[PDB]
Amino acid sequence: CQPIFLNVLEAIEPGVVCAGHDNNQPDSFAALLSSLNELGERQLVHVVKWAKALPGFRNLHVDDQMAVIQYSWMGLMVFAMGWRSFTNVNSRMLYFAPDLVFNEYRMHKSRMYSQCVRMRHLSQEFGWLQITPQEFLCMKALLLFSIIPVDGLKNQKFFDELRMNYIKELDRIIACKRKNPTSCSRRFYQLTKLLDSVQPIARELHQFTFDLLIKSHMVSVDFPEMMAEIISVQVPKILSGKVKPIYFHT
Numbered sequence: 001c002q003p004i005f006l007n008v009l010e011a012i013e014p015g016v017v018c019a020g021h022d023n024n025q026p027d028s029f030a031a032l033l034s035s036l037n038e039l040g041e042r043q044l045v046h047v048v049k050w051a052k053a054l055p056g057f058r059n060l061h062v063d064d065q066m067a068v069i070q071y072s073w074m075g076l077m078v079f080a081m082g083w084r085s086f087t088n089v090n091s092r093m094l095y096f097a098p099d100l101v102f103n104e105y106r107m108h109k110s111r112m113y114s115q116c117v118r119m120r121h122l123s124q125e126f127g128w129l130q131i132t133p134q135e136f137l138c139m140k141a142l143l144l145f146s147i148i149p150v151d152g153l154k155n156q157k158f159f160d161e162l163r164m165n166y167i168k169e170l171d172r173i174i175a176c177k178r179k180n181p182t183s184c185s186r187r188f189y190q191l192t193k194l195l196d197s198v199q200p201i202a203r204e205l206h207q208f209t210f211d212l213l214i215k216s217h218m219v220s221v222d223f224p225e226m227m228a229e230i231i232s233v234q235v236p237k238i239l240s241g242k243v244k245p246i247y248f249h250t
């Protein structure tokens with residue numbers, strides 16, 4: 001147990017990132033979403049640094065590195081948020097950032113109440129399944145390799161191999177506490193189901209942010225440079241079916 005791999009994941013895990021939201025001003029759709037967008041931009045910088053530090057990531061073609069990050073950031077961020085919410089507030093609220101916590105009122109004011117419900121549900125799963133910090137860490141890494149173009153990447157072979165190895169690492173983590181061969185199988189099943197559950201949530205958020213970007217000027221919501229570029233160039237590839245999540249289960 002505690003292989004080199006685990007040492008690495010625990011070492012590169014991003015720290016706390018604030019949204020920069022003004023909690024003194026009364027909530028408003030525009031302010032809440034603009035802050036969420038700014039948070040996304042800030043978190044993206046951390047996700048990029050984190051990914052480049054992942055074992056074997058830099059071996060992928062440079063265009064594939066940027067591509068997987070551009071396609072998987074939503075799922076990665078939502079999954080990490082679900083974890084923060086569970087550990088910080090026991091899933092009572094969505095802990096996007098220390099300065100941007102959503103209670104039911106904000107979930108409503110944000111105009112994405114249903115999406116927040118699914119996200120809070122995901123947060124609860126971390127408790128219902130008793131997910132460990134190590135399991136969380138390995139699952140999150142695997143999420144970076146869980147969405148690619150239907151026609152493949154520049155060098156699919158390398159990606160396929162890397163993804164396989166990350167799956168193997170999850171196996172090791174699972175086997176490192178399951179004496180009985182029955183609980184080990186069940187666990188992998190459970191975690192892959194949890195991992196898959198992230199995709200539909202990310203898709204709904206992709207749909208929502210895309211629409212928001214389109215009418216951003218009319219509702220006065222600001223989108224930082226990178227966010228606007230990725231949501232108008234990469235996200236549509238996902239929504240149009242050119243890029244799809246890799247599901248474990250059908």
Ligand SMILES: C[C@]12CCC(=O)C[C@@H]1CC[C@@H]1[C@@H]2CC[C@]2(C)[C@@H](O)CC[C@@H]12
Nearest residue numbers: 036037039040043077078081096205209
């Ligand atoms: C990824 C972020 C920001 C980082 C995080 O903690 C999860 C959260 C999930 C909702 C996203 C938000 C970024 C900005 C988005 C994409 C808004 O435009 C609509 C949905 C928001």
Ligand SMILES: O=C(O)Cc1cc(I)c(Oc2ccc(O)c(I)c2)c(I)c1
Nearest residue numbers: 003004005055056059161162165166169
């Ligand atoms: O032994 C461990 O746990 C550490 C470990 C983790 C991983 I992910 C891994 O997979 C690859 C695959 C291709 C490649 O170029 C690189 I760099 C790493 C290997 I090999 C070893």
